[PDB]
Design a protein around this ligand. Structure first.
Ligand SMILES: O=C(O)CCC(=O)C(=O)O
Ligand SMILES: [Mn+2]
Length: 219
């Protein structure tokens, strides 16, 4: 649960039907206009990764359409935003209960982007900061809220671009991870996808392919 100031991991936060619904909506959004593509560049490097944005588009920074094909991203489903807000509320309640030092509290989020990352089993994403948001967003420490579904990721995090100084946590299917405030500019990334770790009920009900779906909400 508490990983460092303003960084909370909510285990198995996503409900059954919400996990299925997320996958089904992403499968459909993923094949249409503004769907998944293989990025030519990601800060930190990458392997076996495809992405698509909902809300604002995030290109190699932010815009209304993808330059390479002109497609407008699908908007962020209202259910996704609701679950983001619930995660932030639950984290703030936890932080209030944990207070001994200042009381910690994460800023609210009204996300206008969702980056959807899909990793196959050989997937990885190198260490980087989420630093492309506007200066006021960053200065306010508005959090990043990350959903995990499917196979488990080994997620690295730390203060610098060196794995030797990074911590590791597993992000398992259903987990929501939040980093804001003093943790907003952590270096972070995905070192490994653990094969064959997605819950069977999810693979079966959502017809989920091998790998991991991440949704990362910001601004
Ligand atoms: O897949 C993850 O959990 C990391 C997502 C991420 O850091 C990003 O795409 O900016
Ligand atoms: Mn990131």
């Amino acid at each position: 649960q508490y990983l460092r100031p303003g960084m909370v991991l909510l285990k198995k936060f996503l409900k059954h039907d919400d996990q299925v619904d997320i996958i089904r909506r992403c499968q459909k959004l993923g094949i249409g206009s503004g769907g998944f593509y293989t990025p030519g560049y990601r800060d930190g490097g990458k392997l076996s990764l495809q992405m698509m944005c909902l809300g604002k588009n995030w290109d190699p920074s932010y815009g209304d359409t993808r330059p390479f094909d002109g497609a407008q991203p699908p908007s962020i489903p209202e259910v996704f935003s609701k679950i983001v807000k619930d995660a932030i509320q639950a984290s703030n309640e936890f932080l209030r209960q944990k207070a001994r030092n200042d009381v910690e509290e994460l800023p609210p989020l009204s996300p206008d982007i969702c980056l959807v990352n899909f990793y196959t089993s050989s997937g990885k994403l190198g260490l980087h900061q989420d630093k492309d948001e506007t200066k006021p967003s960053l200065h306010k420490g508005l959090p990043v809220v990350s959903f995990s579904l499917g196979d488990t990721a080994e997620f690295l995090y730390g203060d610098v671009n060196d794995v030797d100084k990074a911590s590791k946590v597993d992000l398992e299917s259903g987990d929501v991870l939040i980093f804001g405030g003093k943790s907003r500019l952590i270096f972070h990334g995905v070192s490994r996808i653990k094969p064959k770790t997605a819950p069977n009920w999810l693979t079966d009900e959502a017809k989920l392919r091998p790998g991991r779906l991440n949704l990362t909400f910001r601004q």
